């Protein structure tokens, strides 16, 4: 889906949407395309262990340094372990192999840290296969998060704005600096235009999706 996302972003950025004669950004809004899943908190502990994260349904996950993943569902008991080749296993906290005790303990450490310290992004949105974090990286400006359902999320450090790109819907959700959450069809952004701030962030997103492709 990354190449589809790249093509969608190219088409919208090529149209120079902030130069529309009259920009009508609101006409591009499509609340039906609001994503089900996004990353609502995260902690990069990759100097030792890896990247812990919360999804907006309050499930939590870790992408460990060895490229395995452990997901704890929002019931607090169901687990999914994903090996580095994508092989999935389904377990529980109450019945799991002893070989996973260290990673379960680490996941619990991340879950508790994020609960005690970090603000939930998108908490104002009222509530599908649960995705896992496929890969991530940071730049000077942002963290880029690639989920296994094809979504790409980009969180900008300076001003707290966020994009959630969904190539299946050809849509982008933008959370602005006031924490207002709006979802747009990319083709309608091409038609109706958008403000310079969003246009600028969609240009940066194309660059970031390009880096993911490699």
């Amino acid at each position: 889906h990354l190449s589809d996302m790249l093509q969608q972003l190219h088409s919208v950025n090529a149209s120079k949407p902030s130069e529309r004669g009259l920009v009508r950004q609101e006409e591009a809004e499509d609340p039906a395309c609001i994503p089900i899943f996004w990353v609502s908190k995260w902690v990069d502990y990759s100097d030792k262990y890896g990247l812990g994260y919360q999804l907006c349904d309050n499930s939590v996950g870790v992408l460990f340094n060895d490229s395995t993943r452990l997901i704890l569902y929002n019931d607090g008991d169901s687990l999914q372990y994903i090996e580095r080749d994508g092989t999935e296993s389904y377990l529980t906290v109450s019945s799991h192999p002893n070989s996973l005790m260290k990673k379960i303990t680490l996941l619990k450490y991340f879950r508790n840290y994020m609960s005690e310290h970090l603000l939930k992004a998108g908490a104002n949105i009222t509530p599908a296969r649960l995705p896992y974090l496929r890969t991530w990286f940071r730049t000077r400006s942002a963290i880029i998060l690639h989920l296994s359902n094809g979504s790409v999320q980009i969180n900008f450090f300076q001003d707290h704005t966020k994009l959630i790109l969904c190539p299946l819907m050809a849509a982008v959700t933008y959370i602005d600096e006031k924490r207002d959450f709006r979802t747009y069809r990319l083709s309608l952004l091409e038609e109706y235009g958008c403000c310079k701030e969003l246009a600028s962030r969609l240009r940066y997103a194309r660059t970031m999706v390009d880096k993911l492709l490699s």
């Binding site: 995260w42 902690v43 310290h117 603000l119 992004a121 707290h160």
Partner: peptide, 5 residues
């Protein structure tokens, strides 16, 4: 880390 509460 993401942002603080």
């Amino acid at each position: 880390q993401s942002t603080x509460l």
